[PDB]
Structure 1
Amino acid sequence: FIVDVKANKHQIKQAVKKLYDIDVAKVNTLIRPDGEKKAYVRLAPDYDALDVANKIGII
């Protein structure tokens, strides 16, 4: 994900959980050069990312 630069890891987890009706194992943030904050969001083992990716339209 690209995520607003002011976001916490707790904040990112509570939003990804709020939108895509998902649940998060752990959140890994970085800040790309160009200053947009990437956020690799690891979904719980019971949840599949190749599926929720289709709902959000990415693939």
Structure 2
Amino acid sequence: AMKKVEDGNTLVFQVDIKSNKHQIKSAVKELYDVDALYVNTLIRPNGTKKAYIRLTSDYDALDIANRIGYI
């Protein structure tokens, strides 16, 4: 997941199973003030939903990861 944070400027999040790509896009905008280029979603074998969120060129996904504080 962290290789995606660096190379493709895409953030990977665990997301609620009931939420759609419109709600995920809104949530990251309200929490972290960031614009998503797209939201690709996926339900994992363990039953949780994974979202690949690519940010627009205005944002550097690595900077956001440091801001959240997990890299």
TM-score (norm 1): 0.96
Aligned residues: 59
Runs (5+) with no aligned partner, structure 1: none
Q: Kindly, what percent of the aligned residue pairs are identical?
A: 71
Deviation at 1:27, TM superposition (A): 0.3
Q: Structure 1 residue runs of 4+, over 6 Å off?
A: none
Determine which of 38, 44, 47 is the counterpart of 2:59: 47
Give the secondary-structure state (helix, strand or coil) at the position aligned to 2:54: strand
Please state which structure has a larger fraction of its residues in strand. 2
Q: Deviations over 1:3-27 (max 9, x none)?
A: 0000010000000111011111100
Cα distance in 2 between the residues matched to 1:45 and 1:10: 20
Please state which structure has a larger fraction of its residues in helix. 2
Runs (5+) with no aligned partner, structure 2: 1-12
User: Which residue number in structure 2 is paired with residue 18 of structure 1?
Assistant: 30
Q: Is 1:31 paired with 2:43?
A: yes
TM-score (norm 2): 0.80
